[PDB]
Design a protein around this ligand. Structure first.
Ligand code: SF4
Ligand code: SF4
Lengths: 57, 198
């Protein structure tokens, strides 16, 4: 039964496919838009800080 | 201006942020306060209090709740007179006198010098205890004087006083605890104030 050798097909086939690795750091992969990265304190359009220091955060 | 000595209580009695303490303003929120029961150290009322401090600095002292002592009230002194320890004049390390100048010294050196000086003083030593010390601290001063310095020269009266006062305190105050209580002042038909301004 060639089925028992199916694995050899998987690895060999994947040899000829383009590697799926993301090219970090030179070509970093795309993080999700909603990703929870660094916190940031934002300003109003006139430049005033938004943070009112309520300490709720 | 609102001139009451108890004005701070109005800040603690307001159910909203209408009345606020200018000192505590924007200093902290409840979650980051370390809050501990306390007793005011200022006068003899001994009010129960709640000391709230943030990052190691006392921000406020609320009235607490002791129905038998102060109920839920303070005077402004107890509520706000807590910054004395952080005005920058605090002694942070033991100090020694050398060449007429007072300079920092290690605890070991300071203890050794003090012990040598006190031993060389034999029984000719006086101990001024002051009124700030707690009961345990006062007991420590008395025990140190009467065991280590072997002297009876202990006096907490850092104020005007008299030998008559010492005799009166020994006869009628010392050992006679809880003879009169706040609950009884509240009910006494007559109260005679002598040399006392409540
Ligand atoms: S929660 Fe309050 S203190 Fe924290 S960032 Fe927002 S406005 Fe500033
Ligand atoms: S809160 Fe005011 S009245 Fe009460 S013990 Fe302190 S100083 Fe005295």
């Amino acid at each position: 039964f060639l089925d028992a050798l199916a694995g050899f097909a998987v690895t060999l086939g994947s040899m000829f496919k383009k590697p799926i690795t993301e090219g970090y750091p030179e070509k970093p992969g795309p993080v999700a838009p909603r990703y929870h990265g660094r916190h940031q304190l934002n300003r109003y359009p006139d430049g005033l800080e938004k943070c009112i220091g309520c300490e709720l955060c | 201006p609102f001139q009451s000595y108890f004005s701070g209580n109005t800040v603690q009695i307001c159910p909203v942020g209408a009345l606020t303490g200018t000192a505590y303003r924007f200093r902290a929120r409840p979650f980051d306060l370390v809050s501990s029961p306390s007793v005011c150290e200022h006068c003899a009322s001994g009010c129960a209090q709640r000391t709230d401090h943030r990052r190691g600095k006392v921000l406020r002292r609320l009235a607490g709740d002791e129905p038998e002592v102060n109920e839920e009230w303070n005077c402004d002194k107890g509520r706000w007179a807590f910054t004395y320890a952080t005005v920058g004049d605090r002694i942070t390390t033991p100090m020694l006198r050398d060449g007429g100048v007072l300079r920092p010294a290690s605890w070991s050196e300071a203890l050794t010098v003090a012990a040598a000086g006190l031993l060389t003083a034999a029984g000719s030593t006086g101990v001024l205890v002051g009124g700030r010390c707690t009961v345990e601290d006062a007991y420590a001063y008395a025990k140190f004087a009467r065991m280590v310095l072997n002297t009876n020269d202990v006096d907490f009266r850092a104020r005007p006083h008299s030998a008559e006062e010492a005799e009166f305190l020994a006869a009628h105050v010392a050992g006679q605890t809880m003879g009169l209580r706040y609950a009884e002042l509240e009910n006494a038909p007559t109260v005679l104030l002598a040399g006392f301004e409540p």
